[PDB]
Design a protein around this ligand. Structure first.
Ligand SMILES: Cc1cc(C(=O)NN)no1
Ligand SMILES: [Cl-]
Length: 145
């Protein structure tokens, strides 16, 4: 399988699924390096973030566990089609890039924080990560180019 992917078994159904230990994506379907990639993201900050402040909230006080629960619920709405990634990022990302529907532009290895860089370069064009942890908080990442 492509870099990072492995097999596992569902606890509740008994059916095989696929999981990526670099991007934290998981799916039923069997999964299908460049100098630069282009990505968007949605950030949820918490009280242990490097800078616990954002354009949404002068003082960010939620716990790391509470932030992960918010990220999990946004992923559910994106996967069911109830909401679009771009819409949720504009309304709820704790990054100034919410301004641009989460778009960060193109970048190379050596510029972003290392777990974000590794996840971005393990995604295929069109693919979305699961929760990704950095010193800034917890992210959902979409590779666009
Ligand atoms: C939700 C999902 C992922 C995929 C896939 O990776 N196909 N190669 N298809 O549907
Ligand atoms: Cl690709």
């Amino acid at each position: 399988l492509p870099p990072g992917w492995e097999k596992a078994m569902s606890r509740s159904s008994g059916r095989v699924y696929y999981f990526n230990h670099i991007t934290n994506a998981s799916q039923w379907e069997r999964p299908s390096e460049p100098a630069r990639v282009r990505c968007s993201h949605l950030l949820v900050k918490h009280s242990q973030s490097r800078r616990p402040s954002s354009w949404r909230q002068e003082k960010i006080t939620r716990t790391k566990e509470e932030a992960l629960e918010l990220i999990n619920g946004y992923i559910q709405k994106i996967k069911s089609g109830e909401e679009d990634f771009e819409s949720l990022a504009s309304q709820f990302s704790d990054c100034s890039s919410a301004k641009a529907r989460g778009d960060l532009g193109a970048f190379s290895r050596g510029q972003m924080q290392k777990p974000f860089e590794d996840a971005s370069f393990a995604l295929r064009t069109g693919e979305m990560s699961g929760p990704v942890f950095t010193d800034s908080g917890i992210h959902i990442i979409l590779r666009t180019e």
